[PDB]
Symmetry: C5
Subunit: 235 residues, 5 copies
Amino acid sequence: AAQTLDGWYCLHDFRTIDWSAWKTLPNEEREAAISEFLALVDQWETTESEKQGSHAVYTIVGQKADILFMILRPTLDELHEIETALNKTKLADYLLPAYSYVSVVELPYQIPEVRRRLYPILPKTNYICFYPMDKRRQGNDNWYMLSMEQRRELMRAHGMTGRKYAGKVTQIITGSVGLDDFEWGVTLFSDDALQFKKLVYEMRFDEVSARFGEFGSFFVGTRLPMENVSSFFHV
Amino acid sequence: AAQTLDGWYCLHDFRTIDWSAWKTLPNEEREAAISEFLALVDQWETTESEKQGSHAVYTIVGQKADILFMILRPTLDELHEIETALNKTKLADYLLPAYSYVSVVELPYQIPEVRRRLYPILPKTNYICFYPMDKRRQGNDNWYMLSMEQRRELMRAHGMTGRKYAGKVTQIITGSVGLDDFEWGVTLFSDDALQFKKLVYEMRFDEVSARFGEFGSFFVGTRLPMENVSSFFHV
Amino acid sequence: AAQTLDGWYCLHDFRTIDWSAWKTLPNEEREAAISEFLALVDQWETTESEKQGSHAVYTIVGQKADILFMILRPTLDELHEIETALNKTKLADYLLPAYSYVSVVELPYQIPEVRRRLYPILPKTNYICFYPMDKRRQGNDNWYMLSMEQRRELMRAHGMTGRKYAGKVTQIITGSVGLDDFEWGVTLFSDDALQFKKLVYEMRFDEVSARFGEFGSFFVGTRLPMENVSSFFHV
Amino acid sequence: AAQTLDGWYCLHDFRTIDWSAWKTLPNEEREAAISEFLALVDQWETTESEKQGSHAVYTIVGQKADILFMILRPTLDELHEIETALNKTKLADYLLPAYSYVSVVELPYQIPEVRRRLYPILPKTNYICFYPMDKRRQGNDNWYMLSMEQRRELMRAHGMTGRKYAGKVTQIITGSVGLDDFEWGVTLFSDDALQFKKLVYEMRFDEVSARFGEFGSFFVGTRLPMENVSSFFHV
Amino acid sequence: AAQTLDGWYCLHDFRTIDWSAWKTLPNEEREAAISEFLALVDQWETTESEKQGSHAVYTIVGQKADILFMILRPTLDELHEIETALNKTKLADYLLPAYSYVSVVELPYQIPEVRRRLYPILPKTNYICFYPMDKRRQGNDNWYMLSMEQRRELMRAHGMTGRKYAGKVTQIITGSVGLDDFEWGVTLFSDDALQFKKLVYEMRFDEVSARFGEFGSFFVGTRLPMENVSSFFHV
């Protein structure tokens, strides 16, 4: 348990858009609100350029959420700062809270492969899928009640399923034990959203998922380039 | 798990109607909003005609939802586009979110029987029933923990129950592993809504349903022809 | 499973009253809204007189709901029509959705017995109690996993407990498999509400309830005569 | 199961206060609304004096609710009447629904010790705690599946734990099988709120609680004398 | 069970900020509301100085809540008084309810180490994490069904894991049996939020957590100094 290495804190902030209200907001006002929010992301972009954090914005299909901001920042206080700056934008008046998830990129810190994984510049893939997950602690199938080695063996086949879908789906696992409601947040990024269905389903036929996986809601969405943001809020 | 073939993405967008607000909206305005939404579906109809997707609109009985749009589009980005165009209609100001489900028509692609099932023109039946379902991964009854063959045998009797209610109920199963909260979305279409009760109950006495079925909410509704849409929103 | 006989579809539409709003609505307007809703029920009453359906209105004690309309109509499309006509009344602007349940009176059809049970004129008893119920499909206690005969034997004692409380409580069971979220909707009607506590508690000490009963929310209420409707909405 | 004796119906009506709205309401209007609600309770007080029912008002700590009205009335129709008169007060416009629980004081009727317990004048103790509870019907630990005698023995030690905390905590158990969502509503009244923690925790180490207790939300609050009501709503 | 010693009642009042509304509130009005709330905390600060209670304000990351007031007061009536004074501030019009938890600092009273633990001046650490927890009473893993000694042994290793993370994370456990929905509220305070992930994860690999831990939502946040309050509400 002490073996996990810790990178960036990660907030997935999912919001819903109050389209009805947003439409009522005059055109020039709506335009400014987009500008304001764009300049905010422009700040985030500067942070990403300095390798001092990362974000992704995705519009989420379905009604669970409309848009996801995923922010990775070095400190949790930075995360809070971002959430709060977001919330105090005009646009955010129309971005109602939907679901949020705090977690920390988890896996020596100096090693480049670790460095990349711990401080990950989030992939600008067409699609993203997020779900929080737990390991079941339920009766016979109690992950925590397992042997270190049994756990290791369980995770061995899970590594294999992941590895099959590498070069298709990038997987960012964030640990959220004592940071949020589940134990891990799994974010996948693929240029093909079906690869998400493929990866997560194949994974379920691993003893680890089959037996121990308790998962939360799945959110999938499509990358919202910032050039596409004005368009998306056009009413 | 790799054997499943993948057709159209499917969004079931269930909304509730805010009748009270809708009534307050002036008559000519309400009329325009219907026109606007009708022209939207007219777009969808064109897509269906080009065999480039499919939709169904059903009004849902009960309070879980008032109306369901079920859209099947080739890409998930198309789905999102539709949801977002819907949401940015006047009418949608009054169609509050109720429940949504994303999933992919799942069952080589070239073969007509597959082609029809993968890219299904949704049946214009009097009634529809939707429920998302899982296979239980709970203790002894852990579907995922099952043998491939045991699974196959389980599904054998389920095929038989389905087949009894073929020519009554059309069944569109969409897999939603890593696309939404459950694993499958089951949509049934029948000209008789009782046949839904008949099919789903008989199915529950199959070991597969009995033992492994974890189901979500059931929604049933009646086809809303577009000629019937102006009528339905008449206040 | 194919042995069940099917009567009327049944909607239990529970609403809450927005008293605060209702009070703000001017007196003459409120009066008209009552008149309008009364004339609606007058329609329903005509349907009941023609033996072409049935309804009951009860005010529900507690905060789960304020009023229940229970409508039994031959077709589900009729049900929808009623819900939608209700919703498009003035009064319904103040009758917020609370909970709803669709189901079909279930128990050859030609026999005058069975006819009565399938097409039941709902009893004008002082009180009503509704709860949706399932049979547990959980581990060892999996009703569906049971023998037909074991089921029969289980239901034998349940019949006996029911029968003790016949001539006190009328029981309308509606099956809702593939019509709603649970498998049965149980509606009881008694002139004494305690008889509900008596019946449902005694039932729980039957193996069938004890072992297999998974129940939903219980709603109990008092019959709202239509002569009492103007009074009840007096503010 | 038929051995339980039945006293007053009991409604616990928990509300939340919409302070923000309440503040906006002019002073003289707020004053009248307090007066109106006070005169309502004055009615309830008259009922209590005639031994024809009982109430308690407590302000509830925490955000689950702000205030609880607990009303015990002979008939359920009386309960409804009270709820509805409450709801149609000005003050109630600001007392949003939070949670409610209907149940019947349960424990021959003529005997004074029964009479007192069945028709209980609720104790004017500094604090109250309410929680609804069930007996587990889950697998091995299925209360209902138990022997009458085993149940009796289970309840024997529970009686002992209760009895230790008698003269500290008054316990009003109301049965709510087929009246609400759980099977019992437990209301405790003590002049010391810690005695609630003491009683309910010690109880959990009884096989009955340990094994069979499924409990709902706990609400604790402080007695709101009616002389303290004007003060409490002062803004 | 009688061995636990009881200190201050503790309310964790988590609120969400209605930023949109707050922005609409004029500047001078918003300024006054901050002043008003600051003067309130100034009252709390005086209480803390007199050692007659304690508070902490933290802004919570994520959408579960925006801000947490944690108040420890000697009596529950004091707690209520505080909640109600908070709620009747201008600022609180914009601090919507999010989640609340009442509980009592639990661990002879005269002894300083007990005194400190029972009447704890909450640590002014950069971060806080709160989660309510239960001990599982589920089947085989029924804590309550355990031997006193087995429990003691279980808690022995839990003490060891805690002790490793002492001098990093301060842990305030509050018992809430019969005060709220779970049995314990765990509040951690660390200058490093990762130490929370570290402590709670390592704890899960203790039989006690692994087997018996049923936990609620986790909230983590950052200390909001009162000099930082004006800033935080700046719009």
